[PDB]
Write a protein that binds this ligand. Structure first.
Ligand SMILES: C[C@H]1CCC(=O)N1Nc1ncnc2[nH]c3cc(F)ccc3c12
Ligand SMILES: [Cl-]
Length: 167
């Protein structure tokens, strides 16, 4: 048992809710919140801008030190950093950005990072400003992640479409 509340169960291990991931994280304080990161950990907008804003820019300060030491992430890759006031840890995962021409095939590799964590609160990778089809992202999530994932979908119209079209 865990404290995630109000989720619809899609599969044995995937759950979904119409929610603002920032407010969800602040309420639950999960072990892991997933950020929709880019390879530079520049948290300017979308989910990343919102998570970073909620940390009062502490996420960005930590991220800049990470990049200065390690260089950029790979598309499809991830790193574990602090969750600050939102979670114990933040798993920064880079899904392909279709608006940059990145290979959508890398979305499966991106979701594989979730399997290193038993339970996660996460957005749909490559959705939103990353330009992929969220219906597709949900399908890849369900067919790739084997650990327990609680998906937060900000947009109510999208949430309803994702549920109603789910196979
Ligand atoms: C990933 C895409 C897929 C459909 C959707 O709603 N997306 N975004 C979110 N998903 C969950 N929580 C969020 N909080 C946010 C705060 C922001 F400033 C901007 C975006 C989000 C957001
Ligand atoms: Cl977004």
């Amino acid at each position: 048992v865990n404290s995630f509340s109000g989720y619809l169960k899609l599969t044995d291990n995937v759950y979904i809710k119409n929610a603002d991931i920032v407010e969800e994280a602040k309420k639950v304080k999960p072990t892991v919140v997933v950020n929709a990161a880019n390879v530079y950990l520049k948290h300017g907008g979308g989910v990343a801008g919102a998570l970073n804003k909620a940390t009062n820019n502490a996420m960005q300060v930590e991220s800049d030190d990470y990049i200065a030491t390690n260089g950029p992430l790979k598309v499809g890759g991830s790193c574990v950093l602090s969750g600050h006031n939102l979670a114990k840890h933040c798993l920064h995962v880079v899904g392909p950005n279709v608006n940059k021409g990145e290979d959508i095939q890398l979305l499966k590799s991106a979701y594989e990072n979730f399997n290193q964590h038993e339970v996660l609160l996460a957005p749909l990778l490559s959705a939103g400003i990353f330009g992929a089809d969220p219906i597709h992202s949900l399908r890849v999530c369900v067919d790739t992640v084997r650990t327990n994932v609680y998906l937060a979908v900000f947009d109510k119209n999208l949430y309803d479409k994702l549920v109603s079209s789910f196979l």
